[PDB]
Design a binder for this molecule. Structure first.
Ligand code: 8QB
Length: 345
């Protein structure tokens, strides 16, 4: 029973030579050698049966990643768990080992325009597949973008993912949100539940600004401060942008603010490619209805050396509806996780 620094990692005999990677709200990740495929892999240990929320996230991810098959999306090679529902306390997700992530890379490395261009193309190609399956990632950020030595990119962590539900997206002002603050679209704080595809596009726009300068574009220190950073760059929303905001608390908050001028992209990023800044502007549009869609972003002149619609595949079977796991307790979801992972036994 290998132990990765004070913790049980029961993955053998197939997985040996274990070394710690990271840890978080997704469980704990480690590297290990696979004696069957003769290569090193990544193993994610999840213990979700204590909390119902963790049961949802585990099932969500397993279900999505098992259906998805795409070069720019991390696959699941194996799932390790106990032979019975009674003995099952943990779930181990085995994935292809990646060398690093874009969060770690941006902390120490300046990217050339060619690297920015290629990484962005890959994000969008993976995102086109995700959205074609009617799925929203909802937590796109540099630590969820994995890379290898040849600059291949894979989107990981679908724990917070949901099936798109545009008809049920409206909500009140300052309504609680789970996804990472710096990459949150402005509508999240105003009137949106984050149930539309446009929320992922905003996150990609933030990632692009981050690749251009090695600094987050909207580094809010807390929740309402996020919207101050966004408005501090985009300027005051137009009358037309405000007409889409019909709940009065959000509307009157925006109207109460002093007039702010848009900070031009060329001043924020004076070394950036003019086409990169034109695409950035379209992804970081205040109005989510006017915001560029994934297929238009792929067709933008900035990505013309890579744009090939016949080599940008879509999902064969989209997810019809969102799984009603909001009220299902940790026991019915334990049986669904057990059934979903049966194939790997
Ligand atoms: O689902 C996940 N939640 C968030 C964290 N996370 C990482 C992975 C993962 C998968 C395959 N390889 C690697 N390699 C690492 C990348 C970082 O730098 C060291 C090597 N990481 C999957 C997840």
């Amino acid at each position: 029973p290998e132990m990765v620094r004070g913790q049980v990692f029961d993955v053998g005999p197939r997985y040996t030579n274990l070394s710690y990677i990271g840890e978080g709200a997704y469980g704990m990740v480690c590297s290990a050698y696979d004696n069957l495929n003769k290569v090193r892999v990544a193993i994610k240990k999840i213990s979700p049966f204590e909390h119902q929320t963790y049961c949802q996230r585990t099932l969500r991810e397993i279900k999505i990643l098992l259906r998805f098959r795409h070069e720019n999306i991390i696959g699941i090679n194996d799932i390790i768990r106990a032979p019975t529902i009674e003995q099952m306390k943990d779930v181990y997700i085995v994935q292809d080992l990646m060398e690093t992530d874009l969060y770690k890379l941006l902390k120490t490395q300046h990217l050339s325009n060619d690297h920015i261009c290629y990484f962005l193309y890959q994000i969008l190609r993976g995102l086109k597949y995700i959205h074609s399956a009617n799925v929203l990632h909802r937590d796109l950020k540099p630590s969820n973008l994995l890379l290898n030595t040849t600059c291949d990119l894979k989107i990981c962590d679908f724990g917070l993912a949901r099936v798109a539900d545009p008809d049920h997206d409206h909500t009140g002002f300052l309504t609680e949100y789970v996804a990472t603050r710096w990459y949150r679209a402005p509508e999240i704080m105003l009137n949106s539940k984050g149930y539309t595809k446009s929320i992922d596009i905003w996150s990609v726009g933030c990632i692009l600004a981050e690749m251009l300068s090695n600094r987050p574009i909207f580094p809010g220190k807390h929740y309402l401060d996020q919207l101050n950073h966004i408005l501090g760059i985009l300027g005051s929303p137009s009358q037309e942008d405000l007409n889409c905001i019909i709940n009065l608390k959000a509307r009157n908050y925006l109207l109460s603010l002093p007039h702010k001028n848009k900070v031009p992209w060329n001043r924020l990023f004076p070394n950036a490619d003019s086409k990169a800044l034109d695409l950035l502007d379209k992804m970081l549009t205040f109005n989510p209805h006017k915001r560029i869609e994934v297929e238009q972003a792929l067709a933008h002149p900035y990505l013309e050396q890579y744009y090939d619609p016949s080599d940008e595949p879509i999902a064969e079977a989209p997810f019809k509806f969102d799984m009603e796991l909001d009220d299902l307790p940790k026991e019915k979801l334990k049986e669904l996780i057990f059934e979903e992972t049966a194939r790997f036994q």
